[PDB]
Structure formats: structure tokens, C-alpha cells
Amino acid sequence: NFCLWNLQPIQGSWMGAACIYQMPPSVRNTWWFPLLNTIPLDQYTRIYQWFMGVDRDRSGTLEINELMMGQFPGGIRLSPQTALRMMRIFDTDFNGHISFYEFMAMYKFMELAYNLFVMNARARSGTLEPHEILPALQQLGFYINQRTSLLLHRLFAMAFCDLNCWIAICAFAAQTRSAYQMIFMNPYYGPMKPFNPMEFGKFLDVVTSLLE
Amino acid sequence: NFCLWNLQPIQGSWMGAACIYQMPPSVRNTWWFPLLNTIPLDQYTRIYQWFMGVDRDRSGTLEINELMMGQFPGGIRLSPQTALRMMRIFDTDFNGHISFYEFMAMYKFMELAYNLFVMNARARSGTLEPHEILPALQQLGFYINQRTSLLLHRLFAMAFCDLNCWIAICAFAAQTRSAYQMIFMNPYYGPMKPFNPMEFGKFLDVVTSLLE
Ligand SMILES: [Ca+2]
Ligand SMILES: [Ca+2]
Ligand SMILES: [Ca+2]
Ligand SMILES: [Ca+2]
Numbered sequence: 001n002f003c004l005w006n007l008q009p010i011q012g013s014w015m016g017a018a019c020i021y022q023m024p025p026s027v028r029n030t031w032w033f034p035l036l037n038t039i040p041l042d043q044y045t046r047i048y049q050w051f052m053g054v055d056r057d058r059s060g061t062l063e064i065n066e067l068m069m070g071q072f073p074g075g076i077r078l079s080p081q082t083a084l085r086m087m088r089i090f091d092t093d094f095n096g097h098i099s100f101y102e103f104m105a106m107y108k109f110m111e112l113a114y115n116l117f118v119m120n121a122r123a124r125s126g127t128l129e130p131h132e133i134l135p136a137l138q139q140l141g142f143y144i145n146q147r148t149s150l151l152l153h154r155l156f157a158m159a160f161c162d163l164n165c166w167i168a169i170c171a172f173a174a175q176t177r178s179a180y181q182m183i184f185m186n187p188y189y190g191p192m193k194p195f196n197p198m199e200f201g202k203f204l205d206v207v208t209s210l211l212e
Numbered sequence: 213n214f215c216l217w218n219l220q221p222i223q224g225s226w227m228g229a230a231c232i233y234q235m236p237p238s239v240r241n242t243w244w245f246p247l248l249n250t251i252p253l254d255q256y257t258r259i260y261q262w263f264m265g266v267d268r269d270r271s272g273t274l275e276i277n278e279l280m281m282g283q284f285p286g287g288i289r290l291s292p293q294t295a296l297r298m299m300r301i302f303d304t305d306f307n308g309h310i311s312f313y314e315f316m317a318m319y320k321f322m323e324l325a326y327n328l329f330v331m332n333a334r335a336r337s338g339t340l341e342p343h344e345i346l347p348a349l350q351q352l353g354f355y356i357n358q359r360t361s362l363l364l365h366r367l368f369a370m371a372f373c374d375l376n377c378w379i380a381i382c383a384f385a386a387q388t389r390s391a392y393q394m395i396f397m398n399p400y401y402g403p404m405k406p407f408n409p410m411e412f413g414k415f416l417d418v419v420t421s422l423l424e
Binding site: 081084085088172175176179182188189190193196199202203206207209210211212 | 293296297300384387388391394395398400401402405408411414415418419421422423424
């Protein structure tokens with residue numbers, strides 16, 4: 001674009017650098033870090049108010065019990081299992097707590113997932129039928145096959161998969177992205193190839209099949 | 213060894229070549245193929261008699277229902293889930309049936325697993341306590357960590373893990389070895405490194421964590 005009245009922000013704007021440079025290196029290094037630059041200051045402040053309502057001991061961090069007990073936007077609730085998946089995605093320094101910055105990324109992740117649920121729940125409001133899982137995951141960036149989409153519905157759902165079970169699926173897919181990073185950072189496998197979503201999709205198909 | 217009275221068979225003896233060359237390429241190419249050369253002709257014949265007792269429709273192949281319904285040595289029974297894991301390991305041409313040769317490898321796999329169960333069930337006969345899983349898996353070639361061993365017990369077991377649940381664990385570990393082969397055969401990852409058990413052990417630890 002060259003129009004002065006419609007200029008778009010650039011990735012890596014100098015105006016954000018100082019903040020980014022002060023962030024913990026574990027957070028900056030994660031695959032999901034770009035979520036944080038999708039959040040405007042007004043939403044940062046709403047998210048903080050949400051955080052304060054889930055932060056039962058005013059520690060300024062969330063522990064898995066607070067995730068298990070918390071309510072999230074859109075009525076989302078996290079089972080003990082899904083809460084652990086969220087910890088394994090977002091607790092980037094493996095110390096058993098999620099910081100505010102890690103929670104912001106989790107919140108935005110859930111918002112994206114929520115949006116895709118509502119956009120893809122076409123057959124029956126409030127649920128995803130098995131055939132609706134595939135397009136919703138693809139739109140999120142998870143390029144799986146049909147067999148995988150039906151398996152995910154079966155494992156995480158009932159004939160219908162509600163919002164909470166969808167969040168659980170998305171958490172599994174994201175936790176598998178973190179796993180891929182952990183596996184392939186091992187220098188045994190040589191220099192890490194750039195991320196290819198189609199190739200990661202095959203990895204996700206293989207890993208999902210191990211859940212039965 | 214140079215003693216004439218104690219000569220050992222060599223891997224790849226010319227005497228076996230003709231048989232090997234007539235085997236389906238999918239069977240020859242599997243990671244578990246070396247199991248087949250551990251079986252003497254007398255045992256081949258016992259295994260065939262076992263096979264005939266599980267082969268309900270005399271097809272000369274076993275389908276998942278026959279695995280679900282069959283009894284195996286040592287009293288082993290396969291749940292529907294474990295039977296599917298056995299199919300995913302041993303049905304090397306993905307046609308929904310296990311041949312006699314694929315069953316022979318499965319049988320020997322179960323025998324190895326059985327032996328290690330009895331050798332490692334020291335605290336209480338008939339069960340493995342969580343601390344006993346680690347040494348038994350290591351002896352089989354699965355170099356996992358403590359956290360993983362406790363997770364496997366929890367997922368597949370109760371305070372005690374019986375023989376059937378141990379077979380299920382071993383099946384999961386073996387199915388993950390097959391997954392690793394599938395993933396890393398993808399030429400995106402470049403030429404496949406030689407198999408390293410310690411490195412695969414890390415892969416198994418990461419993948420196990422995705423089961424919660
Ligand atoms: Ca707290
Ligand atoms: Ca943390
Ligand atoms: Ca049959
Ligand atoms: Ca087959």
C-alpha cells in the first residue's frame with residue numbers, strides 16, 4: 001500500500017522493540033509469540049482485568065489450579081487435562097506458572113479458536129459435527145487429513161463436539177506444535193528446517209493416531 | 213569366537229536369503245523385521261498352531277476382530293485399543309490384515325514383553341509398580357526418563373499395572389517407533405539419520421506427554 005490514509009503497521013516496528021527486548025527470552029523464542037503483537041492496548045487492559053479475576057492468590061501468575069477453576073471468555077472452561085495442555089504450551093520456562101504475557105497469548109489463542117468454532121458450527125448452533133472440524137483446523141493453520149479430523153472429534157468429544165471440547169482439540173494441536181519445536185531443536189537432526197505447515201500437518205496426523 | 217564346537221549363526225546367513233527375498237517388501241523394510249530371525253523352525257510351527265486358533269475364518273490372516281477376541285500366550289488379552297496399536301505396528305501394507313509373518317513378529321514381540329514383565333515384577337508378583345516400568349522399558353530398548361515411566365503407568369494402568377496393561381504400554385512404545393520411521397522417512401527432513409536409541413528415547417518422552 002502507498003496510501004497515506006491507510007498505512008498498516010509493520011511487523012517488528014521500532015516502537016515495540018524496547019518492550020520486546022525486555023521480555024523474557026523464553027517468551028520471545030516461542031512459536032506463538034506473534035500472537036502478542038495482535039493485541040491492542042485497550043485489549044491488553046481488558047485481558048489484565050480477566051487475569052485478575054482468575055488469579056486467586058494475587059501472585060500475578062496463574063497456576064494450573066487457577067486455570068482449572070477459572071472461567072474464560074465465551075463461557076470456556078478447561079478440564080484438568082486441557083489446563084495441563086495449556087500449561088505445556090504457555091509456561092515457556094517450565095516453572096509451573098503462566099505469566100501475564102503468557103496468559104495474553106493463551107487468551108488470544110482461545111479467541112481465535114472461539115471465532116473459528118462460531119464460524120464453523122453451521123449444522124447445529126453450539127456444536128461442531130465431525131465434518132466441521134477439518135475446515136476449522138485448516139483455517140487455524142493445522143493442515144490435517146479427514147481421517148485425523150474424525151479421530152480428533154471422537155477422542156475429544158458424542159455426536160457433537162461443544163466449544164469446551166473444541167478448545168481441547170485446539171490445545172492438543174498447539175501442544176503438538178510445541179512438541180515439534182522441542183523434537184527438532186535437537187541438534188542430532190541437524191539445522192532446523194524453516195516451519196512448513198503442510199509438513200507439520202503430516203506430523204500432526206501421525207501423532208494423533210498414537211492417541212488410539 | 214573361533215571354537216569349532218560353539219559356532220554362532222551370522223546375521224544374514226546365505227541359508228535364509230532365499231526366504232527373505234520372497235518375503236513381501238513391506239515386511240522386510242520394517243524396523244521390527246529382525247524379530248523374525250530369532251524364531252527357530254520348531255517355534256515357527258507352534259506359532260502357526262497359535263495363529264490357527266486365533267484365525268476364526270480360516271483366511272490365513274488376522275483381522276482386528278480376531279486380535280480382539282483371541283487369547284495369546286501367558287494369558288495375554290488385547291483390548292480394542294491395543295489391538296488397533298498392534299495392527300498399526302504389524303500390518304505393514306496397511307490393508308487391515310496381519311499375515312502369518314507379521315503375526316510371528318507380533319508373537320515374538322509379546323514374548324519379549326512378557327519375559328521382561330516377569331523379570332521386573334519384583335515388588336508384587338503379577339504386577340508392575342510405577343518404579344518398575346523404567347527398567348523394564350530400558351531393557352527392551354526404550355530409553356525414557358522417570359517422569360515418562362510414571363506417566364505411562366498412570367495412563368495405561370490403578371496402583372499396579374497388570375500384564376495386559378504392560379503389553380498395552382509396550383505396544384504404544386513400539387507404535388511410536390513406527391511413527392518415528394514414518395515421520396523421518398519424509399524427505400523434507402533430508403537423509404534419514406541412523407537410528408539412535410537415546411535420541412529416540414527423547415522423542416518417546418515428548419510424544420508420551422501429549423497423551424495428557
Ligand atoms: Ca496466582
Ligand atoms: Ca512460566
Ligand atoms: Ca482370519
Ligand atoms: Ca497387512
